[PDB]
Amino acid sequence: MLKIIDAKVIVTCPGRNFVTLKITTEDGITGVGDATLNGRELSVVSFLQDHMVPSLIGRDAHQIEDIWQFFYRGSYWRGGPVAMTALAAVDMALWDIKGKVAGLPVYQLLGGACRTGVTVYGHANGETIEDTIAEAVKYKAMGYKAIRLQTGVPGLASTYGVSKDKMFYEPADNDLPTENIWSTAKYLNSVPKLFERAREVLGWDVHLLHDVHHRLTPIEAARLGKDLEPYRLFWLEDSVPAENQAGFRLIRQHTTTPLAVGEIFAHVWDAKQLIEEQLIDYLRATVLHAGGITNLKKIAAFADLHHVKTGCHGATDLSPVTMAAALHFDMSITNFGLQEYMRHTPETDAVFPHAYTFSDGMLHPGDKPGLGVDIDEDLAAKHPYKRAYLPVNRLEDGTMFNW
Amino acid sequence: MLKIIDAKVIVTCPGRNFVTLKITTEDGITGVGDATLNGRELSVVSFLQDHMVPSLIGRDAHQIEDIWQFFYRGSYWRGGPVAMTALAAVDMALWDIKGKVAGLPVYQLLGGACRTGVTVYGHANGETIEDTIAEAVKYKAMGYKAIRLQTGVPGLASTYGVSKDKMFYEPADNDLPTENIWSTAKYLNSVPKLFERAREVLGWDVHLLHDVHHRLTPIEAARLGKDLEPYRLFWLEDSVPAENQAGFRLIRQHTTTPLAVGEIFAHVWDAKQLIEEQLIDYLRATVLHAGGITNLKKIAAFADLHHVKTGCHGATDLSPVTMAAALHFDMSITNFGLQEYMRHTPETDAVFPHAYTFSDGMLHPGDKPGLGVDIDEDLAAKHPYKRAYLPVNRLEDGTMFNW
Ligand SMILES: [Cl-]
Ligand SMILES: [Cl-]
Ligand SMILES: [Mg+2]
Ligand SMILES: [Mg+2]
Ligand SMILES: [Mg+2]
Numbered sequence: 001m002l003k004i005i006d007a008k009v010i011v012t013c014p015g016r017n018f019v020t021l022k023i024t025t026e027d028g029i030t031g032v033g034d035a036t037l038n039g040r041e042l043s044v045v046s047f048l049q050d051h052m053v054p055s056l057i058g059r060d061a062h063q064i065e066d067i068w069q070f071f072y073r074g075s076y077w078r079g080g081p082v083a084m085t086a087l088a089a090v091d092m093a094l095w096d097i098k099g100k101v102a103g104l105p106v107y108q109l110l111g112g113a114c115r116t117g118v119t120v121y122g123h124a125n126g127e128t129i130e131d132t133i134a135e136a137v138k139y140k141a142m143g144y145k146a147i148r149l150q151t152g153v154p155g156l157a158s159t160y161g162v163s164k165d166k167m168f169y170e171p172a173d174n175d176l177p178t179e180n181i182w183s184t185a186k187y188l189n190s191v192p193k194l195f196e197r198a199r200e201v202l203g204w205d206v207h208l209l210h211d212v213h214h215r216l217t218p219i220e221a222a223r224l225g226k227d228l229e230p231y232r233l234f235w236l237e238d239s240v241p242a243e244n245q246a247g248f249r250l251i252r253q254h255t256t257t258p259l260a261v262g263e264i265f266a267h268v269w270d271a272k273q274l275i276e277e278q279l280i281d282y283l284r285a286t287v288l289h290a291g292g293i294t295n296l297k298k299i300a301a302f303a304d305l306h307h308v309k310t311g312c313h314g315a316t317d318l319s320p321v322t323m324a325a326a327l328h329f330d331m332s333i334t335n336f337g338l339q340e341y342m343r344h345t346p347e348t349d350a351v352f353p354h355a356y357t358f359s360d361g362m363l364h365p366g367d368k369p370g371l372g373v374d375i376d377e378d379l380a381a382k383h384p385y386k387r388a389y390l391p392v393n394r395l396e397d398g399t400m401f402n403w
Numbered sequence: 404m405l406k407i408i409d410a411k412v413i414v415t416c417p418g419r420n421f422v423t424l425k426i427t428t429e430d431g432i433t434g435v436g437d438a439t440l441n442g443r444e445l446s447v448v449s450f451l452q453d454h455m456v457p458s459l460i461g462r463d464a465h466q467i468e469d470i471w472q473f474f475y476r477g478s479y480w481r482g483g484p485v486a487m488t489a490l491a492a493v494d495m496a497l498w499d500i501k502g503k504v505a506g507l508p509v510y511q512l513l514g515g516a517c518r519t520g521v522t523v524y525g526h527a528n529g530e531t532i533e534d535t536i537a538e539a540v541k542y543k544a545m546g547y548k549a550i551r552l553q554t555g556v557p558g559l560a561s562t563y564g565v566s567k568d569k570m571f572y573e574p575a576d577n578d579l580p581t582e583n584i585w586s587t588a589k590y591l592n593s594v595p596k597l598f599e600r601a602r603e604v605l606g607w608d609v610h611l612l613h614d615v616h617h618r619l620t621p622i623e624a625a626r627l628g629k630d631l632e633p634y635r636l637f638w639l640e641d642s643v644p645a646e647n648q649a650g651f652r653l654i655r656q657h658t659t660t661p662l663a664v665g666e667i668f669a670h671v672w673d674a675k676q677l678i679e680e681q682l683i684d685y686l687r688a689t690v691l692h693a694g695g696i697t698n699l700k701k702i703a704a705f706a707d708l709h710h711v712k713t714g715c716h717g718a719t720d721l722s723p724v725t726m727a728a729a730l731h732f733d734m735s736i737t738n739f740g741l742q743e744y745m746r747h748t749p750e751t752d753a754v755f756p757h758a759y760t761f762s763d764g765m766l767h768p769g770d771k772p773g774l775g776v777d778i779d780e781d782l783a784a785k786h787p788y789k790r791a792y793l794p795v796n797r798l799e800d801g802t803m804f805n806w
């Protein structure tokens with residue numbers, strides 16, 4: 001029995017906001033879990049500390065699945081990004097604890113190593129095509145096997161994924177949401193040239209990816225996928241908002257460009273139709289926003305029955321605690337596809353010391369017991385919360401749209 | 404142009420917790436909206452005051468749909484009970500303001516009166532069948548045209564909906580979740596007798612309802628629905644958890660007992676398959692938990708294409724502000740089915756003075772401009788927040804289950 005004696009929520013902003021749950025057991029074994037929900041951080045803080053945490057106290061930390069079900073079913077209102085992110089933080093901390101008790105890295109509990117390391121993709125961006133390709137050349141030189149390309153839309157002042165930051169992209173940049181303007185036509189007429197040029201310069205062995213970031217309708221995404229077929233993308237991501245899962249049927253009927261979706265998904269139900277009808281090739285859902293290792297492991301098993309591989313999201317708003325958890329998960333499944341890896345700031349790496357390392361285009365979680373990560377509370381305390389929002393996006397006529 | 408100059412979240416516990424948003428405009432017109440999420444109340448408080456509210460300041464309150472879209476899309480993570488309940492509060496308050504500007508009750512803006520009043524059901528319960536039926540007789544003498552019946556399960560210490568409270572049921576009763584134990588078989592073998600007896604005593608004109616409260620599988624619910632056909636129930640509610648909406652296909656194939664579901668639903672997507680395959684007869688989703696009048700009006704329109712009527716949830720954890728908004732909505736649609744009405748405490752009614760009245764089995768929202776409800780802030784401040792959780796439920800072997 002590993003009785004839980006304390007559970008605390010820590011908020012810090014070492015370059016951007018992160019929320020972390022730290023659980024302590026009676027004999028001093030601790031675990032951490034990430035609870036960061038970009039642009040709505042404090043709602044999760046409250047969901048944990050005002051509501052979930054009081055029920056953790058006195059529970060046996062060994063009971064991972066029962067605690068998971070207790071919170072998932074016990075909340076009454078079911079799922080949603082706030083609830084599932086809070087649950088993720090508990091789940092990650094409990095797996096961390098399990099590994100420490102077992103004297104083993106978490107991946108050893110989930111099936112053991114299925115690969116030598118975890119292949120990542122990097123984030124090339126620029127205002128013009130030549131700018132983006134110059135960045136991609138850099139990522140290839142740095143040993144990346146896979147690279148996402150995003151580029152400015154001619155005739156629009158701003159677009160998703162293009163900024164002054166080059167090893168990462170940090171869009172939550174203002175204390176009220178930054179407003180953008182969008183034209184779908186300007187984008188559809190321009191973005192295929194990016195991938196034509198990329199293949200001319202970079203060749204055909206490197207994997208190339210693209211995030212549409214929710215801006216198309218299915219018949220538009222069908223067209224974009226066809227236009228991109230000649231360049232053999234690894235995936236085309238989040239092409240259309242996915243609440244209507246049948247929306248992907250039209251895409252799938254018209255293009256063979258592989259499809260990815262799901263960084264925002266909170267539970268299996270957000271992907272069930274997509275997976276069961278073979279409408280996607282990669283599921284982007286994460287241990288952070290879809291309810292932890294416990295839940296993502298179940299989802300991955302279901303995905304593997306339908307040729308779906310994992311392509312976990314990995315933007316900066318997933319802390320090093322999520323990255324550790326994601327790497328243990330990624331190491332231990334047959335149907336791993338790719339792992340996104342945006343670099344954290346040096347201050348973030350200092351606040352969350354961790355065992356995972358990057359070499360030759362792959363991450364590896366290390367072999368420390370548990371997750372192989374912790375939070376330095378003293379350093380965390382030196383970086384207070386700073387309100388910061390994700391941007392919003394409107395059409396040319398002012399219509400509220402999807403960023 | 405009606406500039407928003409202030410927006411405050413007020414938390415009060417006049418017999419149970421309620422959260423309320425109050426929006427003030429430049430020239431003094433105010434609106435209120437309910438934001439209460441039973442057992443997770445403080446998470447919505449934070450989602451509103453730490454994240455949404457800062458964007459409300461300076462906006463034109465007339466722009467109801469644009470503000471709705473701004474929050475729904477702008478949060479990035481989409482939907483979920485916390486986000487959609489926060490959004491409902493904003494939406495209710497904006498409609499309140501709109502009615503006030505227009506000098507009309509809200510139902511007059513949504514289509515006008517479609518009926519003389521809003522028919523409700525009440526809440527008969529007791530430990531034995533005789534006790535439950537005597538309660539029903541009381542409600543029938545009070546002029547209720549529809550009555551829900553819940554009764555103790557022989558051989559179980561407790562069950563859903565049975566307590567010492569008789570005009571309402573207030574299950575969030577402890578500062579940690581109260582634990583219950585469940586046997587499906589004991590319930591399936593016993594509950595039809597309640598409705599057999601009810602028809603012998605009450606007759607056939609009164610509408611009789613039952614809330615299964617998430618405790619069956621589809622084939623079990625199919626059986627219960629068949630067993631209850633002789634008694635012609637108005638609806639059989641929440642028979643199975645509904646994340647897998649295709650679960651209702653088996654129930655529908657086997658029984659003609661009418662089905663209701665959805666008090667917990669946060670958005671149209673939670674009901675889309677249920678509605679489009681004609682799997683239910685009544686949608687239970689509310690202006691509070693499914694994103695306001697704006698969203699529920701759209702959902703009701705979709706429902707009406709598939710013979711689905713509204714049966715909004717109306718338990719105590721929906722404040723009088725929700726009930727006002729629910730009644731304006733209920734008055735103004737063709738496909739109204741029934742409105743649930745649990746009584747609030749006298750203290751709750753005093754904190755939330757309201758125009759709506761009850762007579763001859765119907766509620767009517769009144770004819771004041773706006774919603775016809777307000778919050779008395781001075782009185783609200785006399786009743787501080789008190790943590791209180793919904794109960795949890797486990798099977799005989801300890802398995803975490805659905806309450
Ligand atoms: Cl949620
Ligand atoms: Cl949510
Ligand atoms: Mg910076
Ligand atoms: Mg993305
Ligand atoms: Mg009481």
Ligand SMILES: [Mg+2]
Nearest residue numbers: 614640641666
């Ligand atoms: Mg119910």
